[PDB]
Design a protein around this ligand. Sequence first.
Ligand SMILES: NS(=O)(=O)c1c(F)c(F)c(S(=O)(=O)CCO)c(F)c1F
Ligand SMILES: [Zn+2]
Length: 258
Amino acid sequence: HHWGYGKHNGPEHWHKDFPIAKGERQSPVDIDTHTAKYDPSLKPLSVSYDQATSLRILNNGHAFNVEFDDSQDKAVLKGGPLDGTYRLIQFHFHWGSLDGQGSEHTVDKKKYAAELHLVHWNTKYGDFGKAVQQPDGLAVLGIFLKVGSAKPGLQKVVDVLDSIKTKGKSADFTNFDPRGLLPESLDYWTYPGSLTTPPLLECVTWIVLKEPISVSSEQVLKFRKLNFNGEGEPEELMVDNWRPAQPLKNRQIKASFK
Ligand SMILES: NS(=O)(=O)c1c(F)c(F)c(S(=O)(=O)CCO)c(F)c1F
Ligand SMILES: [Zn+2]
C-alpha cells in the first residue's frame, strides 16, 4: 500500500507515511500574482544547457524521467535567486486527465494542462542524495504547459513513450536537448519549498517561469496513454499525477519582473 495518486493512496494520504507533508515549506503553492513581491535585486536566470548529455528515459510508476549525466558540470542552472551552481539531473512532468488540470503550481488559481520540472542539485553537496537533505539542496525550474500549438522540441520525448509504457521500463535517450522545452522569456517567480511527491523533503528553491510553453492536444494525449502499473497488471492510466496547492504559511513569493 504505497503512495500514489488515488482515493486510497493520493496526496491527502501522504502525511501518514511522510509527516512533513504538513510542514512549513511544502510545494506546490498557488502563485498570487498580485501579491508576489517584485525584487529588483533578483538576477536573470542562467540556464546553460548546451553541453547536456541526456542518457535515458524511465517510467518510474509516478511519471517519466528524462535523465542526464550529472557527473560533471555540463548542464547547469545558476543566477536567478541561487548561489553557486546546480546541475541538471532529470526532468519530468505532471499532467491531468483533462486539459483543464494537471499543473502543480497554479497562477491566480489557474491550472495548466501540465507542468515540467527540470531538477537540479547544488554542487556544493556533491551528489543528489546528499543535496535533498539540505534546505538549499535543489533548484527546480518549473514550466507550465498549455494546450495549443505543438512544441516541436517535445516530440522527441512523446514518440519514445510507447517504449516505456509501464512502470520500470526504460529506454536509451541520448542527444535530447532540453533547450527545446524552454519558453521564450526567463522571467520567473521564486520561493522556498519542497519536493512535490514523497519524500516531500523541504530542500527546493522553486523557480517557476511566468511564460508557459504550448504543446498540442496530441502531445499531451500521448502522456495520458502511459500507465502507472507494471507490465502484466491491470491498466491504470498515468493521469492526474499532480499534488494540489499547499498552504503558503510563512512564505513570500518573489518575482523577477513587474
Ligand atoms: N516533483 S519534484 O520536482 O518536486 C521532485 C523531484 F524532482 C525529485 F527528484 C524527487 S525524488 O526524491 O528524487 C524521488 C521520489 O520518491 C521528488 F520526490 C520530487 F517530488
Ligand atoms: Zn515534479
